Amino acid sequence: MPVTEQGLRERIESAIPQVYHIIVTDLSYGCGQSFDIVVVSDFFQGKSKLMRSRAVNKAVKEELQEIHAFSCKCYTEEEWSKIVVLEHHHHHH
Incomplete structure (x- = not known):
């Protein structure tokens, strides 16, 4: 409700520099407070995951x-x- 998983990707993209790839996936069923997204960038270079x-x-x-x-x-x-x-x-079909 307060946040959209699809919209989250756009927010993340606008919340951080055009990273290599931004993916937003909701672990919980449908909408929910729990969220799970994956992003790859050089921001993790020289820095730990926790620091990120x-x-x-x-x-x-x-x-x-x-x-x-x-x-x-x-x-x-x-x-x-x-x-x-x-x-x-990736993989073949």
């Missing part, structure tokens, strides 16, 4: 006020590491 949360709150402080509890997963291939990515990008 603090920056995100400042960037989207109003979002937190509207949202009782939400998550914002962020990665930049760093977590994956060089190891063996084997690309494995």
Whole structure:
């Protein structure tokens, strides 16, 4: 009600610099306070995931006020590491 999952993506995009990709997914059924979104950016470069949360709150402080509890997963291939990515990008139909 107070926040829209679809609208959230737009807010996030406008709440942060045009990152590589922004995705908003609601973990709870339909609408709810719980939110789960994933975004990839260099913002996580040289900074820990926990640190990003603090920056995100400042960037989207109003979002937190509207949202009782939400998550914002962020990665930049760093977590994956060089190891063996084997690309494995997307999949065939």
